[PDB]
């Protein structure tokens, strides 16, 4: 009955049923392929990233755990409406796509790191991922088309 990738869960703090996607790491309260997709992302690197450097910081020394805390904060702020995805990507994404509000443009299967690709294609149009881990760092992914 659930579509692929989705499972039922209950909140630990409230008991309320929600649904979680183990490909995109998205979670939502409601019960829930193209040749190409277009996405934007926000990348937070850490000391084990393949290249631990960006436009923001020449040497990135934060731990994978500190990177995840930052990603989770940004997700909260985006979900609350307190900040826009695009604004946070432009400020805080450790990737030159920050200068395009995080836009990567359109892409096919075969082109990106696999966890990124699978999350991207498993998102609905307009849906945002949870934290997505790759050799580059931890991503928030927004599917725009």
Curated annotation (Swiss-Prot):
What's the impact of mutating residue 29 to A?
Loss of binding to phosphorylated target proteins, including to phosphorylated RBBP8/CtIP; decrease in DNA repair of double-strand breaks by homologous recombination less efficient than that observed with wild-type protein
Give tissue specificity per the record.
Expressed in immune cells in the lung (at protein level). The phosphorylated form at Ser-53 is expressed in normal breast tissue cells but not in breast cancer cells.
InterPro entries xrefs: PPIase_dom_sf (IPR046357), PPIase_Pin1 (IPR051370), PPIase_PpiC (IPR000297), PPIase_PpiC_CS (IPR023058), WW_dom (IPR001202), WW_dom_sf (IPR036020)
Phosphoserine modification sites are 53, 90
Q: What is its EC number?
A: 5.2.1.8
Q: Which GO biological-process labels does this protein carry?
A: cellular response to hypoxia; negative regulation of amyloid-beta formation; negative regulation of cell motility; negative regulation of ERK1 and ERK2 cascade; negative regulation of protein binding; negative regulation of protein catabolic process; negative regulation of SMAD protein signal transduction; negative regulation of transforming growth factor beta receptor signaling pathway
Q: What reaction is this protein's catalytic activity?
A: [protein]-peptidylproline (omega=180) = [protein]-peptidylproline (omega=0)
SUPFAM superfamilies for this protein: FKBP-like, WW domain
SMART domains found in the cross-reference section:
WW (SM00456)
Q: Where in the cell is it found?
A: Nucleus; Nucleus speckle; Cytoplasm
One of its Pfam families is WW
Q: What sort of enzyme, by top EC class, is this?
A: isomerase
Show where the WW domain sits: 1-32
Query: Which GO molecular function entries does the Swiss-Prot or TrEMBL record give?
Result: beta-catenin binding; cis-trans isomerase activity; cytoskeletal motor activity; GTPase activating protein binding; mitogen-activated protein kinase kinase binding; peptidyl-prolyl cis-trans isomerase activity; phosphoprotein binding; phosphoserine residue binding
Q: What is the effect of changing residue 18 to A?
A: Reduced affinity for KIF20B
Tell me which CDD domains the record gives: WW
| Keywords for this protein | Acetylation, Cell cycle, Cytoplasm, Isomerase, Nucleus, Phosphoprotein, Rotamase
The segment(s) forming the PpiC domain are 34-145
- What exactly does this protein do? Peptidyl-prolyl cis/trans isomerase (PPIase) that binds to and isomerizes specific phosphorylated Ser/Thr-Pro (pSer/Thr-Pro) motifs. By inducing conformational changes in a subset of phosphorylated proteins, acts as a molecular switch in multiple cellular processes. Displays a preference for acidic residues located N-terminally to the proline bond to be isomerized. Regulates mitosis presumably by interacting with NIMA and attenuating its mitosis-promoting activity. Down-regulates kinase activity of BTK.
Describe, as the record does, how this protein assembles with itself and its partners. Interacts with STIL. Interacts with KIF20B. Interacts with NEK6. Interacts (via WW domain) with PRKX. Interacts with BTK. Interacts (via PpiC domain) with DAPK1. Interacts with the phosphorylated form of RAF1. Interacts (via WW domain) with ATCAY; upon NGF stimulation. Interacts with PML (isoform PML-4). Interacts with BCL6. Interacts with FBXW7, disrupting FBXW7 dimerization and promoting FBXW7 autoubiquitination and degradation. Directly interacts with RBBP8/CtIP; this interaction depends upon RBBP8 phosphorylation.
What is said about the domains?
The WW domain is required for the interaction with STIL and KIF20B.
Looking up PANTHER family in the UniProt record yields: PEPTIDYL-PROLYL CIS-TRANS ISOMERASE, PEPTIDYL-PROLYL CIS-TRANS ISOMERASE-RELATED
Query: What is the name of this protein?
Result: Peptidyl-prolyl cis-trans isomerase NIMA-interacting 1
Gene, per the UniProt record? PIN1
């Amino acid at each position: 009955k659930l579509p692929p990738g989705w499972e039922k869960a209950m909140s630990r703090s409230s008991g309320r049923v929600y649904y979680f996607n183990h490909i995109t790491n998205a979670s939502q309260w409601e019960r829930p392929e193209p040749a190409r997709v277009r996405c934007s992302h926000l990348l937070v690197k850490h000391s084990q990233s393949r290249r631990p450097s960006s436009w923001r910081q020449e040497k990135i020394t934060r731990t994978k755990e500190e990177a995840l805390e930052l990603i989770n904060g940004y997700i909260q702020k985006i979900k609350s409406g307190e900040e826009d995805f695009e604004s946070l990507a432009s400020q805080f994404s450790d990737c030159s796509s920050a200068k395009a509000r995080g836009d990567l443009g359109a892409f096919s299967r075969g082109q990106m790191q696999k966890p990124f690709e699978d999350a991207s294609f498993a998102l609905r149009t307009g849906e945002m991922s949870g934290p997505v881990f790759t050799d580059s760092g931890i991503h928030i992914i927004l599917r725009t088309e």
